[PDB]
Amino acid sequence: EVAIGIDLGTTYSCVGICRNGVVDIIANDQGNRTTPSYVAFTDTERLIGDAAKNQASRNPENTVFDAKRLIGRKFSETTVQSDMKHWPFTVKGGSDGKPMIEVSYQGEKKTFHPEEISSMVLKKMKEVAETYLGKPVKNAVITVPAYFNDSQRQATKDAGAIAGLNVLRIINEPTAAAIAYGLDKKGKGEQNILIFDLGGGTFDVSLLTLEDGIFEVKATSGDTHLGGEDFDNKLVNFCVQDFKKKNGGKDVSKNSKSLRRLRTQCEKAKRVLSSSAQATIEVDSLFDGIDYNVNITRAKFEELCMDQFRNTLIPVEKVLKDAKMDKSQVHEIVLVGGSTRIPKIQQLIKDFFNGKEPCKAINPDEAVAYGAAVQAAILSGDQSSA
Ligand SMILES: Nc1ncnc2c1ncn2[C@@H]1O[C@H](COP(=O)(O)OP(N)(=O)O)[C@@H](O)[C@H]1O
Ligand SMILES: COc1ccc(NC(=O)Nc2ccncc2)cc1
Ligand SMILES: COc1ccc(NC(=O)Nc2ccncc2)cc1
Ligand SMILES: [Cl-]
Ligand SMILES: [Cl-]
């Protein structure tokens, strides 16, 4: 009877419930409102979420992430060939052409299809909701990117069925974000909505039209390899060069564990820089037992990422051109994805749209789950949200 909305994200997942017309985004057992889409295998246990991301640098070969980049794809696809450079875990092709993720679990070699890894993330999100509700949860609405094909959607639905969920519907991420803001019920007449979704690994821009409660995806664009991890890498590359200038040319990049530890701290400092003018990147015994410390101003972060931030406007211009419409015709700009919290990105979008304030009242990394939760309640017969 109870239905949840799940954003099964590339890097982070989020679960919400819409009861009595209001939406609660549910915190996990660490108090986090989003959960890493990570699954790790050790000598003793299967870790999911925060626990899996937290030991990634200690167990790189057996820590799986990015299964969303493989779900519903053939191993031979050029996307898989190109993406696999980024993965410390092994991925091979089965006789059926499906990707097989290979890990060691309890001293044994184990293989998993992408939908099996995603089913474990979905199972964790289901359990996060169940702990909060104190009752079992069976029904769910799961979101997918607008460009996902039938194979990708079907495999995501299968991941839900494996997790023990009755998938009421698979819906588009940009549409879920628009539903979260009630833009389907907002007044009347045609409304042109731009969804600017910049997450941990991907960037998606979608131009929607809403006429009479019906959402149509007019045009989409973006970059499948532009997200928060690329901004973290700018801080990593800077710190690697700064360590060289401080420690007689010593190169941290020669040690992959030193890079991973630095990357964890670079991402934390990046988050701090979204609400403070300065942040510290500190790693004790980073490389050769040498302690590392550096202060980064928001201005230096903005400078390192200057081109990447400005280039987010290129897919915005593309969707407007494809939809044959002017930027002045966009009624609402919705900010989605954790990276939209970066002040410079918010300023660039506002300036592009001639001072129009973007819709950001909902925590951007929760807006998709929030909309999916609303849709789950509607599909369960609850008309209180409307
Ligand atoms: N406060 C913050 N400032 C800057 N970046 C932030 C942030 N809070 C979260 N992020 C970034 O958001 C990304 C994850 O975004 P999210 O929307 O949850 O992930 P996803 N799987 O949908 O792509 C990470 O790169 C994270 O560092
Ligand atoms: C209702 O019970 C169900 C039981 C099993 C599945 N699917 C399943 O096992 N699929 C799969 C895909 C790829 N690799 C391994 C497994 C779905 C529903
Ligand atoms: C310095 O400015 C920028 C540089 C690169 C990007 N994106 C990017 O590398 N895209 C990509 C997509 C798919 N495969 C590989 C790469 C964005 C801004
Ligand atoms: Cl419900
Ligand atoms: Cl409760």
Residue numbers in the entry: 33 to 418
What does the article say, verbatim?
A single heat-shock 70 kDa-type chaperone, PfHsp70-x (PF3D7_0831700), is present among the parasite proteins exported to the host. Hsp70 chaperones comprise an N-terminal ATPase domain connected by a short linker to a C-terminal substrate-binding domain. ATP hydrolysis triggers conformational changes in the chaperone that cause sequential binding, holding and release of exposed hydrophobic segments in target proteins. 233 chemical fragments were screened for binding to the ATPase domain of the Hsp70-x chaperone from the malaria parasite Plasmodium falciparum.
Interestingly, two of these residues (Gln339 and Asn343) in the parasite chaperone differ substantially from those at the same position in the human counterparts (leucine and glycine or serine, respectively), raising the prospect that connecting subsites A and B via this path may also contribute to ligand specificity. In contrast to site 1, site 2 is relatively removed from the ATP-binding cleft; thus, it is less likely that ligand interactions there would affect the catalytic activity of PfHsp70-x. Furthermore, the site comprises a shallow surface on the parasite chaperone, which suggests that engineering high-affinity ligands targeting this site may be challenging. PfHsp70-x residues in contact with the ligand JHJ include Lys130, His145, Glu147, Glu48, Asp190, Ala193 and Ile194, all of which are conserved or conservatively substituted in human erythrocytic chaperones. Thus, all evidence suggests that site 2 is less suitable than site 1 for the design of potent and specific ligands of PfHsp70-x.
